[PDB]
Amino acid sequence: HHWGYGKHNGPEHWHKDFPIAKGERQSPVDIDTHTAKYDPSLKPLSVSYDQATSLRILNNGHAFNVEFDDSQDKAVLKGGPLDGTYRLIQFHFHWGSLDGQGSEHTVDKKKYAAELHLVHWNTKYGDFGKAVQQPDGLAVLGIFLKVGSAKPGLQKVVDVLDSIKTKGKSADFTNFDPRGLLPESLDYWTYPGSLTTPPLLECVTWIVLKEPISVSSEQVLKFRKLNFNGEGEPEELMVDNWRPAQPLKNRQIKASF
Ligand SMILES: NS(=O)(=O)c1ccc(N[C@@H]2O[C@H](CO)[C@@H](O)[C@H](O)[C@H]2O)cc1
Ligand SMILES: [Cl-]
Ligand SMILES: [Zn+2]
Structure with missing residues (x-):
């Protein structure tokens, strides 16, 4: 009985194996744009993905991870609310069964498709494992996806999905440039949060971009053809792999604009 997104193992059940699910800084959260406050102490955000080195794409049974070689300071995130350098380790998505839902964070309760x-770990801690034992160990850059025009930079990801349909499957995925998934503006909201799936560790500085990127209906439809199940097992389409908004509690969301 592994955690998942179903009726008997979904988000409302996670707290049993992961008590921190009801913690003081859980993610995602609803971003109330009018309550968010511009923060002048925030320094310019720096996304340096020019030397990013992707290696493989994996269907882990909950989503698919595009993994990067993080053995060196190549693709890094710094500036903004961050103190130090955060290294890109992988990126993945959360999506719905319908265009009307799918995002984890919401904006004024609005859900994106x-x-x-984009997951990064604080290099001051040596590696991801040590980073998730720290209050400022991780930084995740979140970007909303809406359905409209296709995102050219996303197509290479979409086309490799047929080779990793089921849980456990992976495929070589080198030379993928994540810069092709970024919107024009880097305006963002930021707050202290957690991983949105078990272990739900509260070590994340969330940086959620205000401008969503547009992807085509065809592109997201292919996301929905993936499976939660392993090869040879009954098909469970990988859809609605998102956790709903959690209590904001004692937190303030800051705006970079
Ligand atoms: N949705 S998220 O970005 O908050 C998120 C949720 C779970 C993880 N899990 C961790 O992802 C790392 C990189 O894939 C793994 O090394 C580590 O074992 C695993 O717990 C990462 C980001
Ligand atoms: Cl189901
Ligand atoms: Zn995620």
Whole structure:
């Protein structure tokens, strides 16, 4: 009985194996744009993905991870609310069964069709494992996806999905440039949160971009053809792999604009 997104193992059940699910800084959260406050102490955000080195794409049974070689300071995130350098380790998405839902964070309760998460770890901690034992160990850059025009930079990801349809499957995925998934503006909202799936560790500084990227209906439809199940097992389409908004509690969301 592994955690998942179903009726008997979904988000409302996670707290049993992961008590922190009801913690003080859980993610995602609803971003109330009018309550968010511009923060002048925020420094310019720096997304340096020019030397990013992707290696493989994996269907882990909950989503698919595009993994990067993080053995060196190549693709890094710094500036903004961040103190130090955060290295890109992987990116993945959360999406719905319908265009009307899919994102984890919401904006004034509005749900987007999907949400991209670029995961980074604070290099001051050596590696991801040590980073998730720290209050400022991770930084996840979240980007909303809306359905409209296709996102050219996303197509290479979409076309490789047929080779990793089921849980456990992976495929070589080198030379993918994540810069092709970024919107024009880097305006963002930021707040202290957690991983949105078990272990739900509260070590994330969330940076959610205001401008969503547009992807085509065809592109997201292919996301929906993936499977939660392993090869040879009954088909469970990988859809609605998002956690709903959690209590904001003692937190303030800051705006960079
Ligand atoms: N949705 S998220 O960006 O908050 C998120 C949720 C779970 C993870 N899980 C961790 O992702 C790392 C990189 O894939 C793994 O190394 C590590 O074991 C695993 O717990 C990462 C980001
Ligand atoms: Cl189901
Ligand atoms: Zn995520």
